[PDB]
Amino acid sequence: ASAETVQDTVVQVIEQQMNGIDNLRYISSESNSDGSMTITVTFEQGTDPD
Amino acid sequence: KVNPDGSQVRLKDVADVGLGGQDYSINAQFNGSPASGIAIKLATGANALDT
């Protein structure tokens, strides 16, 4: 599918739910043309990544 | 369904398409007026007053 369908279909609700995690820095995303999609959520330092 | 003559059956006159709710089983009122709302918790490690 195209970029706008993925962007208002998947990224909306996953980025909606991935607030409310404590100790965040910024929640950013990316919705590509060929059906790829990624969300890179960044935590402040002093948090064990596991 | 549709025949090769052109006569067809839409979802008109079979159904009544219109927007509604997921689950009608729970109904809530607030002093007579219909109401729904958010139950907001508190994340761990956060001051509640300015929250």
Side-chain angles (χ1 to χ4, degrees):
Chain A
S2 62
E4 65 269 14
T5 63
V6 175
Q7 186 264 334
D8 66 0
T9 294
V10 174
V11 175
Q12 278 288 112
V13 62
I14 292 176
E15 189 178 1
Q16 176 185 2
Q17 292 292 323
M18 284 181 181
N19 288 112
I21 292 99
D22 52 352
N23 201 2
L24 286 175
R25 184 178 285 178
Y26 53 84
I27 169 73
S28 66
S29 173
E30 181 177 1
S31 298
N32 287 317
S33 67
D34 55 354
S36 297
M37 164 262 175
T38 183
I39 293 175
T40 301
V41 49
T42 299
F43 296 91
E44 284 285 328
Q45 302 177 2
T47 303
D48 199 0
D50 56 356
Chain B
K1 67 186 290 183
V2 50
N3 300 118
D5 198 4
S7 69
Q8 63 190 359
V9 177
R10 297 286 195 182
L11 198 59
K12 302 188 294 294
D13 287 330
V14 172
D16 292 329
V17 177
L19 286 84
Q22 295 285 325
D23 193 0
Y24 288 97
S25 65
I26 298 168
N27 191 3
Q29 295 89 17
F30 185 84
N31 305 120
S33 63
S36 68
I38 306 101
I40 298 168
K41 291 186 186 291
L42 183 61
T44 299
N47 193 354
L49 294 174
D50 56 353
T51 296

